[PDB]
Amino acid sequence: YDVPDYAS
């Protein structure tokens, strides 16, 4: 699973 950064 590969997630976006929270700050994006």
């Epitope: 699973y1 590969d2 997630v3 976006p4 950064d5 929270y6 700050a7 994006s8």
Partner: antibody
Framework: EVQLVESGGDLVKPGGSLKLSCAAS????????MSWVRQTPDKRLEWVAT????????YYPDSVKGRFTISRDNAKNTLYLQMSSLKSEDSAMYYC?????????????WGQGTLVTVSA | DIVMTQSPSSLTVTAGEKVTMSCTSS????????????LTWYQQKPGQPPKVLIY???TRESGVPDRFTGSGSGTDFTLTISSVQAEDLAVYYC?????????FGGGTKLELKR
């Protein structure tokens, strides 16, 4: 005890390329995104790049796009930053810090830096 | 880009006194998914990388002294050290952890009186 150890920084002509590695141990690497923050000799800290825990999303500031590339090898547990089109203003200590995937809370784990001096 | 503005850049203290430094954002950092203002405070001592004192504007890291408090919301935030010791003369920065580019403040440096 999480352990991020940077490498690669040398004296590099304004222009040339350099790639720094950052070996990380003591956490499931694949689970976290990583960053490179930079601190200038005027003792100013600067975000330089973030990358996904998986690799597919990369994020840069207007000042690094085109010249640097954050990269990781989850099989070898290592971050990379290929730096090209090196400038004078880029001389600094380069740190890798890990991203807080779970808690979304500050850069909690820092490496011990590597220094790069761009000069001829 | 949220600019970070910390004033003062140098604060001169006496050990045992209370001291408060300010951090200002250009926009809000309140993240409504976590329901938290995503500001982080860091301390750094010469030779070291920075270390978290306070995250989510006011939560203290496991191991930071009781004397270090983070307070504030939206665009106006403060660090307060209830009674400064000499193990506290370091530089303090805030950081915008809310959206890219991530921006750190300029630092405030504790210098000791004599």
């Amino acid at each position: 005890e999480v352990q991020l150890v940077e490498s690669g920084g040398d004296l590099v002509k304004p222009g040339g390329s350099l790639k720094l590695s950052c070996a990380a141990s003591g956490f499931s690497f694949s689970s976290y995104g990583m960053s490179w923050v930079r601190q200038t000799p005027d003792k100013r800290l600067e975000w330089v790049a973030t990358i996904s825990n998986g690799g597919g999303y990369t994020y840069y500031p207007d000042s690094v796009k085109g010249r640097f590339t954050i990269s990781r090898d989850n099989a070898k547990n290592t971050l990379y930053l290929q730096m090209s089109s090196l400038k004078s203003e880029d001389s600094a200590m380069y740190y890798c810090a890990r991203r807080e995937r779970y808690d979304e809370n500050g850069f909690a784990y820092w490496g011990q830096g590597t220094l790069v001096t761009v000069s001829a | 880009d949220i600019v970070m503005t910390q004033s003062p850049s140098s604060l001169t203290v006496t050990a045992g006194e209370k001291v408060t430094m300010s951090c200002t954002s250009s926009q809000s950092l309140f993240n409504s998914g976590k329901q938290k203002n995503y500001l982080t405070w860091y301390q750094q001592k010469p030779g070291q990388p920075p270390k978290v004192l306070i995250y989510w504007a006011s939560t203290r890291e496991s191991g930071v002294p009781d004397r270090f408090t983070g307070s504030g919301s939206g665009t106006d935030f403060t660090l307060t050290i209830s009674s400064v010791q000499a193990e506290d003369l370091a530089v303090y920065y805030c950081q915008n952890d809310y959206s890219n580019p991530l921006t750190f403040g300029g630092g405030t440096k504790l210098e000791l009186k004599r």
